[PDB]
Write a protein that binds this ligand. Structure first.
Ligand code: HEM
Ligand code: HEM
Ligand SMILES: Cc1cc(N)nc(CCc2cc(C#N)cc(CCc3cc(C)cc(N)n3)c2)c1
Ligand SMILES: Cc1cc(N)nc(CCc2cc(C#N)cc(CCc3cc(C)cc(N)n3)c2)c1
Ligand SMILES: C[C@H](O)[C@H](O)[C@H]1CNc2nc(N)[nH]c(=O)c2N1
Ligand SMILES: C[C@H](O)[C@H](O)[C@H]1CNc2nc(N)[nH]c(=O)c2N1
Ligand SMILES: [Zn+2]
Lengths: 405, 405
């Protein structure tokens, strides 16, 4: 039942007992493992009531008050509310606890050592796209903090039986436009072609740069989404230069400070928050490796290799591997110079190892998706490569949800 | 959609469905409730007949004679043989097919584009440990072929009803000694401390270098294992140097040419071949990244970085990343110089994508273990990182088996 989990570098073993608490099926079966798939194929009062209770039980236990008067009364409130209305509402403190727990539970997140330090903005009294914009701006300002980045989440109104969802259409709060050219290519970020086109269509005046910050498309229930331009002074950006390579700065490369996911659903106690954007700070491989070097992203390896005068003719010269290292170094150097928070993949994975150990003591296990935890360069050079990991779904949870269009 | 796993490549945006996984008869370690794909080792006449019938059906399909008199007579011959004796025997071309099929089925091997090109040495007549030695030496000579390496496998007699197994105690045909020092460190390869100490226990006179080739501990049915030293002239080795860093040759690093796994079980139609070593050629990251840079192996990252004058006191200089690239380049360069076959991780993973496409057409899928297929440096720089993979067990197969001691 309970899996033995081994670290191969140190030869140590733990047993994951926490997985017995999963109530939600992942994609694998005994016949075949599907653990490497990015998305699940997937994309009543009795059932809401029991997730509700389980979460309230979670919360009172967290404040050591299991079984107290306050606990029993709270379970009664929840039961009374569901029975009469088919739904219920969380108290602010309960929400706060749920958001941290959803982060704690996120198997794909290597930054979870930070999970206890999360500023939570209650935006549940939001009634318009306009109000959503104000809240999003205050989040960005708080989170950014002149480069001294602070983790945060802002929670818009939950989904309801009657009506359309509150949604942020953009996948992140800051995204660069991707412009489909005649010549079939893309100018800017190819990942954001579809969102750039939705923006233009809803009336945005596009640019023609490689790094034009997109406007937000915000949707109040059952209304057309609305367009809002982020004030340039709120979007902190970092020009990329290299400590020793003078020509690198010439490339004109840059990236934003704030990684803020905005298309994911936050589930707490059976309740669903379809708009609940959250941010921390970047690990440098996200920018240096994936965003700049993925062949379907900015795909800049070749340009850099040529600048370094490397032998591009053959894979055996490891030109790809050499240019990648310098691009990652440029990202770290630049963020450090500009006094904006960043973590390298060695420091991050070492702290994830400490987190694994903390969670083993605290909860008897830690859900983790090895393919997402291990960095996209220098995998086996980090300690997580050598760590077996068990993957499963615990609730509170961040989930993927359909695109609104 | 089809009710088979949908599989996506996130670089090209292309989709396939794995229908091959339907043929899987053995459960792996995952369940709906938790994924265990990252674990290295996760965990009767009627049963034999049924595996035998299935393998014979595979054989006759492969020669396009499924349904024929020859097919049903072979079936008849197999069940008669199990009826009277409890076991059965494969024809020669049946063994050749099954050996190739087991390589083809190996989810952890990125080298599978070559699967059709395997020299199968039949050693099912072997009857002593001395003869095992002769066969093994012939394998190495043929496979090594003065540096122009050729894939091969040698098959020794299968497990018999209450008769002892043929076993090769060593994990590979070529391994360096690991000597546990009286200060607690290890000289040589720490992976091989146990087998080194079994070797000495059985009367081997040990050396004291970092790169002493171990002797072979060969076990014939019901006999204690016997010890055989490989004649040095049969063990091709490559001294490591760097194309531009002149001091790298002074490190006195080296590696052997021939990777030959010798502790795996080859299972075909229920029959179990406990000694059946097989060899290919190396992918460079196995040597330059894992074998040399793993903390629990040669661990040379720090030494190399010091020679390169890197800042080894801060993670954010990427000192580990820069040293690893250079050690990897040195492995490729030294092998090329010495005319000994090797393949870099770019060329290997590209060829594996081609293999994925061939197998989609030929069998409707390909079992693949993402954590093992993705190379341990430059992960997302290779096309396999962006390819979803389905993992399941098909037979014939190579399986792990308990250590003989
Ligand atoms: C504090 C600094 C943080 C760091 C360095 C960090 C690090 C990372 C990294 C490297 C990834 C993989 C991302 C990718 O490949 O695109 C990730 C994923 C993720 N993180 Fe974090 N994280 C941080 C904070 C947070 C916070 C505050 C939350 C939510 C409260 C969070 C929840 C998640 C989730 C749900 C994923 C999976 C995203 C997806 O499926 O697309 N993380 N994290
Ligand atoms: C032709 C050149 C070949 C290349 C480049 C190659 C490449 C590799 C690599 C890089 C691995 C992972 C090794 C590790 O991380 O320790 C591997 C594993 C494996 N390969 Fe190959 N391979 C080749 C030929 C073969 C052959 C000839 C066979 C058997 C007939 C084979 C069967 C296997 C098996 C069973 C594994 C998994 C072994 C384990 O779990 O330890 N491969 N291969
Ligand atoms: C808080 C935080 C901090 C930090 N340092 N990094 C992150 C991860 C960022 C991330 C952004 C996007 C986007 N857009 C997609 C991903 C995953 C890729 C993806 C791709 C697709 C197609 C859908 C989907 N839901 N996700 C990750 C978050
Ligand atoms: C034919 C061929 C070609 C090629 N390029 N590479 C290989 C496989 C390499 C490999 C070797 C060993 C060993 N010894 C162990 C492994 C597995 C790692 C391992 C390590 C330990 C300690 C235990 C265990 N069960 N498994 C892999 C084969
Ligand atoms: C197909 C494969 O699962 C996919 O490329 C994953 C691999 N690992 C990852 N890991 C992280 N952190 N982020 C990613 O986007 C991915 N992509
Ligand atoms: C814990 C993890 O499964 C383990 O370190 C795996 C990861 N991927 C690997 N991939 C290959 N090719 N070889 C290995 O030994 C490993 N080790
Ligand atoms: Zn799985």
């Amino acid at each position: 039942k309970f899996p033995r989990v081994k670290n191969w570098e140190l030869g140590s073993i733990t047993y994951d007992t926490l997985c017995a608490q999963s109530q939600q099926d992942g994609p694998c079966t005994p016949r075949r493992c599907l653990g490497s798939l990015v998305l699940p194929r997937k994309l009543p009062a009795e059932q809401l009531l029991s997730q509700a209770r389980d979460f309230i039980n979670q919360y009172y236990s967290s404040i050591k008050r299991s079984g107290s008067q306050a606990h029993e009364e709270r379970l009664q409130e929840v039961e009374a509310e569901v029975a009469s209305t088919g739904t219920y509402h969380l108290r602010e403190s309960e929400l706060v606890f749920g958001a941290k727990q959803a982060w704690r539970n996120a198997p794909r997140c290597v930054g979870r050592i930070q999970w206890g330090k999360l500023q939570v903005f209650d935006a549940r009294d939001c009634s318009s796209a306009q109000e959503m914009f104000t809240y999003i701006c205050n989040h960005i300002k708080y989170a950014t903090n002149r480069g001294n980045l602070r983790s945060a989440i802002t929670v818009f109104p939950q989904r309801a039986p009657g009506r359309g969802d509150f949604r942020i259409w953009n996948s992140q709060l800051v995204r660069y436009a991707g412009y489909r050219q005649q010549d079939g290519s893309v100018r800017g970020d190819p990942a954001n072609v579809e969102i750039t086109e939705l923006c233009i269509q809803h009336g945005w005046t596009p640019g023609n740069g490689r790094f034009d910050v997109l406007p937000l498309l915000l949707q109040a229930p059952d209304e057309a989404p609305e367009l809002f331009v982020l004030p340039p002074e709120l979007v902190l950006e970092v020009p990329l230069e290299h400590p020793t390579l003078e020509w690198f700065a010439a490339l004109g490369l840059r990236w934003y400070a704030l990684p803020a996911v905005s298309n994911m659903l936050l589930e707490i106690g059976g309740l669903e928050f379809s708009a609940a954007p959250f941010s921390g700070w970047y690990m440098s491989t996200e920018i240096g490796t994936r965003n700049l070097c993925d062949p379907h992203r900015y795909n800049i390896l070749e340009d850099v290799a040529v600048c370094m005068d490397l032998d591009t003719r053959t894979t055996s010269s490891l030109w790809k591997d050499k240019a990648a290292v310098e691009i990652n170094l440029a990202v770290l150097h630049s963020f450090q110079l500009a006094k904006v928070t960043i973590v390298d993949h060695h420091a991050a994975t070492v702290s994830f190892m400490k987190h694994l150990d903390n969670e083993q003591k605290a909860r008897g296990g830690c859900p983790a998706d090895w393919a997402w935890i291990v960095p996209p360069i220098s995998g086996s050079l980090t300690p997580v490569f050598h760590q077996e990991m068990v993957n499963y779904i615990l609730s509170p949870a961040f989930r993927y949800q359909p695109d609104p269009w």
